[PDB]
Design a protein around this nucleic acid. Sequence first.
RNA 1: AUGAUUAAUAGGGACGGUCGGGGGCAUCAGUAUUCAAUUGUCAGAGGUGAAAUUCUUGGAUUUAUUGAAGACUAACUACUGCGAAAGCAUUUGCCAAGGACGUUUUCAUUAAUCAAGAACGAAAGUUAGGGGAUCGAAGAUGAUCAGAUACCGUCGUAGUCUUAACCAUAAACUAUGCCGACUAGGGAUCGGGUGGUGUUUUUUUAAUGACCCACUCGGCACCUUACGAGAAAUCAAAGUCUUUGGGUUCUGGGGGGAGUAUGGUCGCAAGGCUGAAUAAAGGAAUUGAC
Lengths: 91, 41, 163, 30, 49, 148
Amino acid sequence: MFREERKARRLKKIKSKTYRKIKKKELMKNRELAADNEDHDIARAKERMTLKHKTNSKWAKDMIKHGMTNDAETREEMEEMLRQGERLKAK
Amino acid sequence: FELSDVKSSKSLAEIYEDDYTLSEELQKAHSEISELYANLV
Amino acid sequence: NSWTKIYPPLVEHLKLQVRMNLKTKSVELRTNPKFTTDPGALQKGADFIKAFTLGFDLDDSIALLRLDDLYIETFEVKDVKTLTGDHLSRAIGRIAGKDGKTKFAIENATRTRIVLADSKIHILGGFTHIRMARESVVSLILGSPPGKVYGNLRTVASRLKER
Amino acid sequence: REERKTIIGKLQDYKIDTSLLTSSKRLGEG
Amino acid sequence: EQSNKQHRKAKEKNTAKKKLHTQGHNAKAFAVAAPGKMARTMQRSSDVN
Amino acid sequence: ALRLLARPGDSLYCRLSANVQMWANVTHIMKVGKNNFRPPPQVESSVVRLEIKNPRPQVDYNEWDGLLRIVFVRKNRTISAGFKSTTVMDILEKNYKTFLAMMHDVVKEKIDTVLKETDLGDKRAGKCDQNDFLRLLYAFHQVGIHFS
RNA sequence: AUGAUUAAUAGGGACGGUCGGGGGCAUCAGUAUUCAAUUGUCAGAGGUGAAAUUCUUGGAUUUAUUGAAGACUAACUACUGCGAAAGCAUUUGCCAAGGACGUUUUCAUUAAUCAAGAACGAAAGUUAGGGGAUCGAAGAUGAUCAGAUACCGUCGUAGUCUUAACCAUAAACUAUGCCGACUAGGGAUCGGGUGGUGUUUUUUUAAUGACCCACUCGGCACCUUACGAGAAAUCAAAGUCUUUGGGUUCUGGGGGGAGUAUGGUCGCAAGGCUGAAUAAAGGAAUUGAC
Ligand SMILES: [Mg+2]
Ligand SMILES: [Mg+2]
Ligand SMILES: [Mg+2]
Ligand SMILES: [Mg+2]
Ligand SMILES: [Mg+2]
Ligand SMILES: [Mg+2]
Ligand SMILES: [Mg+2]
Ligand SMILES: [Mg+2]
């Protein structure tokens, strides 16, 4: 337990978006390989009423209105948000 | 040229042992091409 | 768990008289006057077992029994630079690299073996091999990114093959 | 300037070679 | 191929309220009471000029 | 460039400014951005105009450097302190032995009088003008001390 | 001699045993660096990728018995502790100070936040003394050959230390105000307390001390979590059922990389004596010409 503990706060303290993005990327690849429409309809059902994943959100509206998403890296994050929202709206 | 970045299977005794004893591996591919060609032609 | 593969080479090839003492938790090697023949076998056996004692794979340690011009180089990070806290902890990560790749990169190019016992580093090889390895690991300590070191490791690798 | 002119003009009265004078470059030798 | 993240510098440029006093006097004190009449009357005067 | 154009009392005022300014006048012309070159340098660029004085001001090239250097070892520190260093006394003491040829306590006292009489011993080299050094340069010549 | 009620899982004070690399003043130890004495030996020693300045037959380096100077507390040192923060690791003593815990002790709203105002404040830096072992900006000088070892060496001023005073800036970071309540499971660690018919010890018993187990306070934190938030990284707080009220201080009105002009504001030089001077075979050539 002490060893498994010892590995955590060192990992918890490393918050670097490049490092965490790489870790998240490979985690999803492992998730998909290793590990029904009713859940999807419910998932779209929530998405279609809340309208959470477009540019009217506080963060997305803030980036767009200020010539600030023209930088590519933040645009990728904005676009990733839209596709994931687009995926939920898919039929 | 490429330098391997994984642990070598051979131990330091083994890598040197290889030195104790142009390339046979090249000469096997030398022949394997010929039979493929000999069968292809 | 590795002892089954440790005493055979010493007792048979080196003709040494081996024992390990539980009470003091130490290994014992004695020269047999009626059987031992090589004067340098006893120290050679001592040299071999120490390498395992420093953290080395047995098979790598066997190289010291087989050859005679293999030596241990050792140093600490603090000798290079006084890094502390995260700076020290990161610096260790630099030497190993992701998945330990960087440590394997140096080892193949230089023909040595590296154990990163926390801030303690030990190197096995020929005198020429270990010295250049000392340069590469130290260059990482000073803050050089490994990718640049990887290029230099490739450069020295070609020189090794030509000669 | 006119004050400068007097000093530089007066400097002519006190001018000497530098050949044997050790420069201040030697200051750090200690 | 490593690009570290930019360190967003602490603002050394004058803040907006400071900019008002960056002239010989306090810019906030020499104002008018009716800015609406300020713009209208001037625009007429400018064309008359 | 900003060191060359630096004026007395400014942060960038230095030995290079003091030396160049008395043999010539340097004036800024324009600023050149790093984008104006490729591959873009890591430093900004500038254009300056250098006008060398004719006639050359008749002061020994070595003497002017000698005084400038000992006082610019710490430009923001008092001139008196700049002469407190032990080696400054030793290099200077022998220079006085040269003057007599053609005494450490004496050269100490002589320096004390010069800095006191010129009222320069309590100011800083970073806030000194050409005239101030020239007056300092004289007061040592009168008492027989030549720097270089 | 004489009018009111609580004693807030608010606060202050008291008392009990503890706890801490908290602070100040003394004191002890500790190798190591440098230097010096004695002592055995004789050629180099040193340093780099490779070398030379450099010291060395008045004996270097190295060996051993000591002594002296000034710093500084390695290994123990940890996903631990203390302090408001900056910071804080040898022994023992004095000085006062402090959190938490226990309390069927005490005062009764004495509290939270904080312009003005005040104390402390990393390293560097300034003034005037002391000290000056090591390191060491500045500086000189050896070498300037070779790209993994490409900035190395020797000397070394200020400085590094201390006394009495100045400055007040950091990625002074959790890029994350303070106080209060509530909102998931798990076991590791620190300090204290409670309990057991638990182990070891006390090697006469015992009681303590050290461990084991369970619980309970406060602290650094850590795993899992479709509990909620976020775009996401991630967060027990950056959460409090769709849009918004528990109390209060401060800050911002737009980011990043480049340019243009200025009826604007504030700044910013020197110079007056001094002046040079065959185009081509008119060739190449161990290589050519006839
Ligand atoms: Mg009106
Ligand atoms: Mg109460
Ligand atoms: Mg108490
Ligand atoms: Mg402790
Ligand atoms: Mg604390
Ligand atoms: Mg002093
Ligand atoms: Mg910090
Ligand atoms: Mg709270």
